[PDB]
Design a binder for this molecule. Sequence first.
Ligand SMILES: O=C(O)c1ccc(-c2nn(C(=O)c3c(Cl)cccc3C(F)(F)F)c3cccc(F)c23)c(F)c1
Length: 241
Amino acid sequence: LTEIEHLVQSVCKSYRETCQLRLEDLLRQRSNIFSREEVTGYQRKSMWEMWERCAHHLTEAIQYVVEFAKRLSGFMELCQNDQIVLLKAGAMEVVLVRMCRAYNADNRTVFFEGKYGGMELFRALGCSELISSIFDFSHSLSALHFSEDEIALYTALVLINAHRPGLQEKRKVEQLQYNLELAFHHHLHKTHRQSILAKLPPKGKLRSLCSQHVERLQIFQHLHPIVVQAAFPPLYKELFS
Ligand SMILES: O=C(O)c1ccc(-c2nn(C(=O)c3c(Cl)cccc3C(F)(F)F)c3cccc(F)c23)c(F)c1
């Protein structure tokens, strides 16, 4: 009925449509785990081949988040400067949250290229601390057993944040943010899930993990650049220098 319950519906719709894999497909594939032969197969690959595989998977993930943002009510009505500022700071933070869906807390594995595997699968990359921190973030997020609607509403709030430095129309961003906070709060009350609010990761944790991740991606892109057909060209030039 209210403009808020419709907001919940459209945010969940944008998310349902911009998801790469279905939650039940990832849950049913938890049995399909890489063999020790397939693991060594990945470990023996060049850093540069592993980088190309991961770089493409991560650019495609960002592109789905870009589409998710495009479909959020009022995002397109914000100015290009504000759209870049939000996506630059938040798109990879959304990808990192989304990642908990493809993470199995039982054996500490992630769904990568058709099967589940441990962090050792990424050895050739030579950035074990960063990969361990990503696996740790997904492990803490998985303990919340986030529903699909909760992850949709929370990721919208990760993106729509008026506190990002460099915004031109801060007030137009605040209005979008306040409506999404009401929508998230309203939904958690309706479903008796307000208890996750105290369990959500601190703002600084996500920002800190994301800044470390993107800077490492930026080091690899400098050393071995990949080519990507840009979905949002002005965003692409701000990240790919
Ligand atoms: O318009 C597009 O299609 C588009 C696609 C990807 C990005 C993007 N890349 N990105 C990387 O960290 C990244 C990735 Cl995922 C792989 C290899 C190289 C990079 C690099 F570090 F170079 F940016 C991002 C980090 C945060 C926010 C982003 F928006 C991006 C982008 F800005 C635009």
